[PDB]
Design an enzyme around this catalytic site. Structure first.
Site, PDB file in Angstrom:
ATOM      1  N   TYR A 180       0.772  -1.156   0.172  1.00 18.92           N
ATOM      2  CA  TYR A 180       0.056  -0.010   0.164  1.00 18.92           C
ATOM      3  C   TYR A 180       0.750   1.328  -0.018  1.00 18.92           C
ATOM      4  CZ  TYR A 180      -4.186  -2.941   0.422  1.00 18.92           C
ATOM      5  OH  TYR A 180      -4.858  -3.923   0.140  1.00 18.92           O
ATOM      6  N   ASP A 209      -3.840 -14.058  -1.409  1.00 23.95           N
ATOM      7  CA  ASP A 209      -3.378 -14.354   0.159  1.00 23.95           C
ATOM      8  C   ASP A 209      -4.900 -14.391   0.991  1.00 23.95           C
ATOM      9  OD1 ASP A 209      -0.763 -14.329  -0.609  1.00 23.95           O
ATOM     10  OD2 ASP A 209      -0.435 -12.216   0.025  1.00 23.95           O
TER      11      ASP A 209
END
Lengths: 346, 346
Positions: free
Chosen positions: B122, B237
């Site tokens: 991010y 994930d």
């Protein structure tokens, strides 16, 4: 008063490493101390998986070992498995609720994760060399010698965690709990952390390196080479781990991060010294246990104890403590072949 | 009463997932539930690093975006960063002190670690598309909309952690603290965990998948494709993460692991339902916020809200809850292209 997302818009660059406002946003564009970002980066780059390494031949070597040499190797193996069972969980449990800067928080989580990989590598080795792994794993808990080390090492973590809980729940001051007096002191808690970090530094920088010597000694005899291949990867990680705690400790005592911690670190400087000495002596007594039924080519109680003192002196100077032993040269220069990495000084 | 190395030689195969004897030796030769060992294995195999992905072109696309489309993308980005800032630390802090089987302990640590990688991804995206990342990161804390979500989500974690601390420190019963009555109940604590796990399941299985849709909608327009490349790795994930909590929740309510938890899960089945509904509604209201200044090609408030209901129904059935919405088909079948992995059903 622990919050998994603190609501205040704080400047994470001006927070202390520990006991400040709990980290809210995890950002990695900036750091107060870029050392921890570098450690994260390096550890990520080192990412390995135990079952890459073929440890098949180690079964044959192990079975061929004389009984006392089996004792040496398996006692060593069990001690390591004990240590990183603790290192697997404890940095997360003990340190996370206290961290107040993002780069340190993520380093600790990355650190502990890399330990679970070490623990998984230990299972990998054990499964391949013994017929009944359960016997090995059980002895880790019930072994009189191993148990003494586990108790002392875990206590530094446990006391920090419990005092942390009181601090979060009760805050600073003198309190009444079921009719008893409970005094919560940030200064005391800061001390518990410092001592714990000192202990963990000893654990990874001294105790484990004593064990590396035992493993690489087998490899010097061209025995248990699968194990040694794994220990090399483990040692490379360990150099990062101890570097981490070295910076935490030195940044704390310098007073640059937290001026109160500078005074606290001086107040218990003797205690830290005594802690490191006690650990060195415990590893010396461990050498005694390893070689109680005899030694092997290139490694005995005397040589290993020399290495304990040699490595202890180095580590303690790194964290600003007096040297407890005579200045000596490296008693086992052959170990440096195994403790080498092009990306970090192991 | 938390110990980083419990001294009792227990049979880890017969321990409950939670609230049993703290794990001493970390071993991976055996499991009570092999699902968590498989999740560890899969997540290890998925290990990736954010800066592999070239997000350079995303800066150009972002600057070219209309103001309202910037608002859509950056609000989405900020929400994700909020969520996995929490997911970075919270599974470790909240769950580790309560786990009593080795394979679950290591899964949680591996889980949380993979979240730090998401958070790092991010930062990677933000640094590359905006000129001042600090503005973005600060708004994550002070944004009225984002803040409402953070408060609710973190509270489930915080209440579990605090009650955990009391339980470790005080044990079960009715206690006196500074002249106040503190009643510690294992049954209550077990409930706090179950609800927290329900919340986290909603977080990862619903909230994040609502966000994936927003991201992949840009990629459908051949915009912000670096970001989408990363979201694909993140989604892969996330499928593991939600699978983890699905098994924890289902093993808990079945009564196979802990018969008391079966009753507790039934007692608060309504509460879990209400929790999941409240989350769905909150994401619906979030869609409102995203598209308040207008929508884009292939995605608006109506379409996204349809997807919320569609995905919410699926997730809730997976954890044994009643469906809160009409049975509907997939309103955005184009998303399945992006949510695909050969090693796991994303």
């Amino acid at each position: 008063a622990y919050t998994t997302f603190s609501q205040t818009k704080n400047d994470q660059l001006k927070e202390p490493m520990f006991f400040g406002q709990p980290v809210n946003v995890a950002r990695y564009d900036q750091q107060k101390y870029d050392i921890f970002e570098k450690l994260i980066e390096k550890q990520l780059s080192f990412f390995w998986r135990p079952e890459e390494v073929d440890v098949s031949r180690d079964r044959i070597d192990y079975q061929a070992l004389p009984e006392h040499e089996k004792h040496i190797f398996i006692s060593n193996l069990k001690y390591q498995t004990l240590l990183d069972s603790i290192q697997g969980r404890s940095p997360n449990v003990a340190l996370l609720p206290l961290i107040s800067i993002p780069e340190l928080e993520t380093w600790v989580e990355t650190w502990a994760f890399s330990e679970t990989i070490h623990s998984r590598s230990y299972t990998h080795i054990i499964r391949n060399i013994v017929n009944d792994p359960s016997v090995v794993f059980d002895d880790i808990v019930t072994n009189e010698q191993i148990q003494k080390r586990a108790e002392g090492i875990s206590s530094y973590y446990d006391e920090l965690i419990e005092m942390t809980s009181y601090w979060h729940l009760l805050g600073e001051g003198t309190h009444t709990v079921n009719g008893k007096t409970v005094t919560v002191s940030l200064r005391e808690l800061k001390k518990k952390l410092y001592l714990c970090l000192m202990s963990v530094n000893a654990l990874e920088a001294i105790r484990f390196y004593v064990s590396f010597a035992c493993s690489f000694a087998f490899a010097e005899r061209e025995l248990m080479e699968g194990n040694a291949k794994i220990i090399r990867l483990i040692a490379r990680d360990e150099a990062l781990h101890l570097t981490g705690t070295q910076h935490m400790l030195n940044l704390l005592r310098s007073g640059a991060d937290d001026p109160e911690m500078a005074e606290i670190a001086e107040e218990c400087k003797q205690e830290c010294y005594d802690l490191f000495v006690q650990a060195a002596q415990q590893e010396k007594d461990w050498a005694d246990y390893l070689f109680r039924d005899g030694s092997m080519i290139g490694l005995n109680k005397d040589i290993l104890c020399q290495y304990v003192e040699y490595i202890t002196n180095i580590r303690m100077q790194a964290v600003g403590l007096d040297l407890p032993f005579q200045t000596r040269s490296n008693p086992i220069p052959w170990i440096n072949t195994w403790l080498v990495s092009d990306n970090v000084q192991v």
